[PDB]
Amino acid sequence: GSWAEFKQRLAAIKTRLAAIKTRLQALGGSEAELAAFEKEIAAFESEIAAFESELQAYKGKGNPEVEALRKEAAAIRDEAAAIRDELQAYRHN
Numbered sequence: 001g002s003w004a005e006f007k008q009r010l011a012a013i014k015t016r017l018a019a020i021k022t023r024l025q026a027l028g029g030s031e032a033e034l035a036a037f038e039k040e041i042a043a044f045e046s047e048i049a050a051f052e053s054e055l056q057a058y059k060g061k062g063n064p065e066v067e068a069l070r071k072e073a074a075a076i077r078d079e080a081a082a083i084r085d086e087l088q089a090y091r092h093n
């Protein structure tokens with residue numbers, strides 16, 4: 001890995017969070033459609049957690065500077081998890 005590559009793949013994760021936010025605007029007509037979206041957001045959280053782990057392994061080669069990128073990735077995972085929690089609650093009333 002490299003700093004430039006981790007910044008690029010973090011930017012790709014940011015685009016994915018923005019896409020989830022845009023696609024919340026497709027919801028309203030019915031609650032049953034939220035299950036697939038919740039499963040998709042949980043898969044996104046797993047994808048981000050795997051990226052935090054990869055960054056920690058790069059830190060493990062003697063590169064403390066990557067903590068800035070790990071903090072940002074974990075904040076995105078927290079935002080995604082907060083959105084999934086709200087959909088689950090709405091789907092079940």
Ligand SMILES: [Cl-]
Pocket residue numbers: 019020023
């Ligand atoms: Cl999409």
Ligand SMILES: [Zn+2]
Pocket residue numbers: 001005
């Ligand atoms: Zn690579």
Ligand SMILES: [Zn+2]
Pocket residue numbers: 023026
């Ligand atoms: Zn759509």
